Amino acid sequence: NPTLFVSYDQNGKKLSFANWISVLSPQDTPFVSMTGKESINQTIFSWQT
Amino acid sequence: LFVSYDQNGKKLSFANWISVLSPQDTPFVSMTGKESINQTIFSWQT
Amino acid sequence: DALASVDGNNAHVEGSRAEDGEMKPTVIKSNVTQILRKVVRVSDTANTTANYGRGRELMYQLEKKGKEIKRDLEKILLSGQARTDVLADQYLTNSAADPA
Amino acid sequence: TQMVLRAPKRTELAKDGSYEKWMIEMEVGLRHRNPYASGVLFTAAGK
Amino acid sequence: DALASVDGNNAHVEGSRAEDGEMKPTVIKSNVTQILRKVVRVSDTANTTANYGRGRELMYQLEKKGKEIKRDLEKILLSGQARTDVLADQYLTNSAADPAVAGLNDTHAARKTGAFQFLCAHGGLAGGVVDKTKNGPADPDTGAVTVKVAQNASNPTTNIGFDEADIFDMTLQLYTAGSEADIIMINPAHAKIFAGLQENTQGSRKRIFENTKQFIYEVNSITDPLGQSYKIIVNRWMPTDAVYFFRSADWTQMVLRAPKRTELAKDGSYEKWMIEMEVGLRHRNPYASGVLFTAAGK
Amino acid sequence: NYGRGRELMYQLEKKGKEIKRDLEKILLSGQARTDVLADQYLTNSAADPAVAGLNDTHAARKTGAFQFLCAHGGLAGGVVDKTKNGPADPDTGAVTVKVAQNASNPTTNIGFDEADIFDMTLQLYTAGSEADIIMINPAHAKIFAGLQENTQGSRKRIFENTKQFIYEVNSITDPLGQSYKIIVNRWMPTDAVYFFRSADWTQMVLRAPKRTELAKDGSYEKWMIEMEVGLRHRNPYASGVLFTAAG
Incomplete structure (x- = not known):
């Protein structure tokens, strides 16, 4: 029941909900982008040198 | 690990109305009557 | 909200500077929900055999407890x-829930 | 008024054998316009 | 919000059950607005005359004020x-109200917005202004520090500037966080630094001139060792104690009450007017822009 | 409630990106x-007799990282050692795993070498490696820009009446003619430098990442993501690793 209307005496204060969320975590992954993928069928693979 | 107690941007579910029980009957005034005047002081005789 | 108290002596002067007066803010009332839960654990071993004394035990039991929850809600x-809750004074400054 | 967050629904759970479990849950609350809009009268004494 | 830094070396067995992960919620920011005002008062007599090089004393004085308010804003x-504000921990105001300062009136203090420095990764405060003698914190997920106190160890104590190498250190911090800053706003008094990249003790991209009739001595574009091309901009109204690394899209001006016309009472040969507008400032992420303070050398 | 719609799909996306961040x-x-098996490829007897019987009590597995697959020359526990130089190639006289000597830049600062880097390109040239890339953490990219013109003396990098500033080096030419290409990696460690070639490394995929909803047994609504992959390297001496050590 404020006599002098101000912002600090209002029982309302309907908050302003932004329509976005900020994120900066990058996912460049330069190595994984240049390696190449080869499908296998065993948990262990071997090669000779 | 997400649970309802951890949410932050909770869009509140506020009610769009206000209730007040303050009566506004005023019975006496609704039975006395009104007579317009043009002065700050009135008088009668008995 | 509630109107101000009756001021039975709000007598002013014929001509004077109007004073600010007085006002009153609103009052917020908050409540929290409750979780009502009912489950069933009827097996199927005795449900595979064709018995004469019983027709079903799953759908019938669901309806039984399906009514109890209402009989309990009231x-x-x-x-x-x-x-019971631990989220007090976290509505107008609820920008972030209780970290504790 | 009856404030409901989750309406009634018969949910089915996992099957770790012949258990055959089920679930019925709902989430509601209660709202009242003004505390002084309704009245309560307690009736009790010593014992 | 930001992803989790639990990367580590997660290794799981083949025949286990899904164990509960590590979930973290978001983080809410909040800034308050500030009230700008410019008053005008001119006696009716002066407003009725006809000045020798303009119109009325009211509109002319109003236009002068309408421009000063914009300068004060920048x-x-x-x-x-x-x-500077009186409230505290009352943004998620949903469980109750704040009657602590409700029985007050215009006696309330003056509200202030969160300026460029306060919205960034500031390390501390100085009562009402950000403290430049403290190095800001680091982001939880990344390890970037967008608020760095210049060392200036390269340059001597005679000239102050901020530094010549500390400019490249911020680009590293921004890239480390993932910011897309591409602008370097600077005070005109410090432009001699970005142009005067010399005085590096005989090294580091010093100088040369091919005896030409053109002398520029200016640096507008910059590229860091990582490839982030930056463009230097000058702002006359910028302070001379810090440099800003930011992006236009990562900032917005929150306007609540726009400037409008306000005719007030007279009270006798006053003809009073007023200008007023409430505005705030926003920042998508404190770690999306850099602030390079200035300090002496050795 | 208002404002806060859902946190299930949002969290799935967050986890979908985190799993890839970890891989890099x-x-x-x-x-x-890391593995519980050993020398079970030439006995021609069975997979493993002594490991059978344990259903899920086994320990986790680990893939040979960039350092393990190279001529590391020793281990410091669960991670390759960053101090002991790799073993010299028996055939050639190459050493692809070295440690920065830190000649200049006194011990006041860690100071990754900034010099003698052409030695590694020599070790590679001596090993027939076709390395053409130098993956490095951005925290040490300035050392390559200073390689342009610092030389602790008068080399006089020039302006030529220009306003554009570059001070960036991304390509280098070894004295032996080997032209390399510098690349920045935010996920690389701040104490290593990888000289290699893309074609010499392959990604062995066994279980591609896929979402799978699990049992509820209540209001849990549990979800998970899982992927099984490995790493391959043709020849250890086909790539090099240069650590950083002050003193």
Whole structure:
């Protein structure tokens, strides 16, 4: 029941909900982008040198 | 690990109305009557 | 909200500077929900055999407890219990929930 | 008024054998316009 | 919000059950607005005359004030005030109200916005302004520090500037966080630094001239060792104690009450007017822009 | 409620990206090959007799990272050692795993070498490696820009009446004619430098990442993501690793 209307005496204060969320975590992954993928069928693979 | 107690941007579910029980009957005034005047002081005789 | 108290002596002068007066803010009332839960654990071993004394045990039991939750809801609403929660004074400054 | 967050629904759970479990849950609350809009009268004494 | 830094070396067995992960919620920011005002008062007599090089004394004085308010705005948004306000922990106001300061009146203090420095990763405060003698913190997920106190160890104590190498250190911090800053706003008094990249003790891209009739001595574009091309911009209203690394899209001006016409009472040969507008400032992420303070050398 | 719609799909996306972030970091971390099997390829007798019977009580597995698959020359526990130089190639006289000597830049600062880097290109040229890339953490990219013109003296990098500033080096030419290409990696460790070639490394995929909803048994609504992959390296001496050590 404020006599002098101000912002600090209002029982309302309907908050302003932004329509976005900020994120900066990058996912460049330069190595994984240049390696190449080869499908296998065993948990262990071997090669000779 | 997400649970309802951890949410932050909770869009509140506020009610769009206000209730007040303050009566506004005023019975006496609704039975006395009104007579317009043009002065700050009135008088009668008995 | 509620109107101001009756000022039975709000007599002013014929001509004077109008004063600010007085006002009153609103009052917020908050409540919290409750979780009502009912489950069933009827097996199927005795359900595979064709018995004469019983037709079903799953759908019938669901309806039984399907009505109990309502028969319990009313008992809870009309109860004299107290609201239980730990999110007090977290509505207008609720920008972030209680970190603790 | 009856404030409901989750309406009634018969949910089915996992099957770790012949258990055959089920679930019925709902989430509601209660709202009152003004505390002084309704009245309560307690009736009790010593014992 | 930001992803989790639990990367580590997660290794799981083949025949286990899904164990509960590590979930973290978001983080809410909040800034308050500030009230700008410019008053005008001119006696009716002076407003009735006809000046020898203009029209009425009212509109002319109003236009002069309508421009000063914009200058005051540019200087405040780029200041380092600490968002002076009385409220505290009342943004998620949903469980109750704040009657602590409700029985008050215009006696309330003056509200202030969160300027460029306060909205960034500031390390501390100085009562009402951000403290430049403290190095800001680091992001939880990344390890970037967008608020770095220049060392200036390269240059001597005679000239102050901020540094010549500390400019490249911020680009590393921004890239480390993932910011897309591409602008370097600077005070004109410090432009001699970005142009005067010399005095590096005989090294590091010093200088040369091919005896030409053109002498520029200016640096507008910059590229860091990582490839982030930056463009230097000068702002007359910027302070001379810090440099800003930011992006236009990562900032917005929150306007609540726009400037409008306000005719007030007279009270006798006053003809009073007023200008007023409430505005705030926003920042998508404190770690999306850099602030390079200035300090002496060795 | 208002404002806060859902946190299930949002969290799935967050986790969908985090799993990839970890992969780029694990392959370049330098962990050690972990497994419960050993020398079970030439006995021509059986897979393993002594490991059978344990259903899920086994220990986790680890893939040979960039360092393990190279001529590391010793381990410091669960991760490759960053101090002991790799073993010299028997055929050639190459050493692809070295340690920065830190000649200049006194011990006041860690100071990754900034010099003698052409030695590694020599070790590679001596080993027939066709390395053409130098993956490095951005925290040490300035050392390559200063390689342009610092030389602790008068080399006089020039302006030529220009306003554009570059001070960036991304390509180098070894004295032996080997032209390399510098690349920045935010997930690389701040104490290593990888000289290699893309074609010499392959990604062995066994279980591609896929979402799978699990049982509820209540209001849990549990979800998970899982992927099984490995790393391959044709020849250890086909790539090099240069650590950083002050003193």
